[model samples]
Target: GALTESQAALVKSSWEEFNANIPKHTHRFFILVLEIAPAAKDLFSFLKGTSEVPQNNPELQAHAGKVFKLVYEAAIQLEVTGVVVTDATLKNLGSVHVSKGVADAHFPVVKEAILKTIKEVVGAKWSEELNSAWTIAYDELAIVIKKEMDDAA
Candidate 1:
């Protein structure tokens, strides 16, 4: 549910570049995610009539900030948040996503998009260690999200 000390260090260090431009990275992230799974857009009501992500869309940017902030805070908190991100927390979390028909499958797709976004920003600083660190945090969150989604469904 959270990152370890070393992983947190790597993630936090990498975050300097990531936080440098959240809107820029998140714009790329949404583009990458929808590129991989256009169908996932159905989960977003804000996209309404557009098959594309409108640049500088306030609603989309707000949503992106919420999602990005979660990981950044998780990295900064650096605690075992499986306990903190308790069953009820994810119960609500999964229920929200479930209502929009998010399946366990989309988790990996978003994760890929996230890493790709980071890779582009971190440029010369990207490394296996950094990837491994981010993977642990993401997968930990994913494991519980799927679990709770299953229950919520």
Candidate 2:
């Protein structure tokens, strides 16, 4: 799936437009939306041409919301752990060692720590739900990003 130069330009400009329009707190949300779109598409593809759920089905929306909530909760928990580790390491080192490009080199360790904590606190079912939700949510994000690009272009 190669995009033509014109399409690439459209996407880039749309991304810039989206960045400018979105509020600061929601900037990460826009990025997450772009990142997760492909996952959503795959999860929802099964519903295509199904007579059970209409296009605007409330039940489907509820399910989508649940998936989004699970993904967000898991991601945020990891992020908070990253921040905590970053802060503690900085304190212990007596100097802040910021990577010129990648922020903290210890990010992976921090992430693993957070994941370990998650495993101890939550059940395996939560992990499974998080994966399933992310898979489905990504496709939804892709569609949204494309639509935004089309609208902006």
Candidate 3:
């Protein structure tokens, strides 16, 4: 496994805890991302033209669900196979982000939003072990995903 056994176990447990409210939580996550970088909304097709928050918008929620679903995917993969992200998934992400004009710098903005989202949503269950697993997993995924773009470009 990419993560040590214990770390992957933590990711699995934390994922179950975090999975309870995917739609609502992921929606809140993007809102938090906007709060951190309002300009980043330009990166989102759903938020690009609106001055108003995309509250309860199905498009935004649908987008968020897909985004967090990747997290869920990676978490399970780590626990089951030790793969941080599937190769095909990373390649597809690289292509999509490139089409959307995403920069290498944009990765960590999502990372920060994810960390904040999990800390808040997972609440009392957010132990240091879980936190570390999340961090390590994200960082590993970022490296591969970013490298895929860099190589393709």
Candidate 4:
């Protein structure tokens, strides 16, 4: 389901705050992802060692920014145009992830990391409504992305 009006407003306002510190938040997101699933770091060529080295690597910094931008863009699209546009955007992203050999199993880990990061970034402004809104958005995109990946396979 798409976000309710209030849910979209909550996400948009909270996202504005989150976007202000995109670099830091995105860095934290990837760090959390690696913490949750160390093997996931192998997906990134520039991420070796899976610890301090990956955290400090310039390549990780650059890639994390790109990932953040893609995610931020999708969030904005979902907020403005709803799932129709977001699905198309995510389907392409899914195909790319599949080509990079990212397993379907990785999505849940990333989703959890993302939700935690969002909550952290949004601070006290986080609410059940906001959580539900973002969850729906992410799950909708995940379904489309997985479908694309499956079709490609």
Which structure among the candidates has the greatest lDDT? 3
Better model by TM-score: candidate 2 vs candidate 4? 4
Instruction: Give candidate 2's whole-model lDDT.
Output: 0.32
For model 1, what is the alpha-carbon lDDT of residue 53? 79
Local lDDT at 136 for model 1: 66
Model 3 global lDDT (CA atoms, 0 to 1): 0.75
Off by over 4 Å in 1: 1-5, 75-84, 87-89
User: In model 2, which runs have C-alpha deviations exceeding 4 angstroms?
Assistant: 1-53, 82-153
Clashing pairs for predicted structure model 1, backbone only: none
Give TM per candidate: 0.83, 0.23, 0.84, 0.79
Please, what are the lDDT tens digits per residue for candidate 4 over residues 1-153? 466666777767766776687557767987799788977766777765455434466776776656544544555567677653535655677677777888788888888987888888788877788888777766765666677788666
Per-residue lDDT for 1-153 in model 2, tens only?
Answer: 123333233333322332342233132332233243323222334344553323355454444343233323332333234211123322322221211111222233323332332333234434443433333333333333233333333
Clashes of 3: 0
Highest TM-score model number: 3
**lDDT of candidate 1 vs native?**
0.73
> What is the per-residue lDDT of model 1 for residues 1-153, given as tens digits with 9 covering 90 to 100?
245666677787777777777668778888899888987776787776787777788887777766655665555544445322545655788788888878877888988888888778778877787887776666666776788888878
Per-residue CA lDDT of model 3 for 61-120, tens digit only, reads 777777665675676577678667447867877788887878888888889898888788
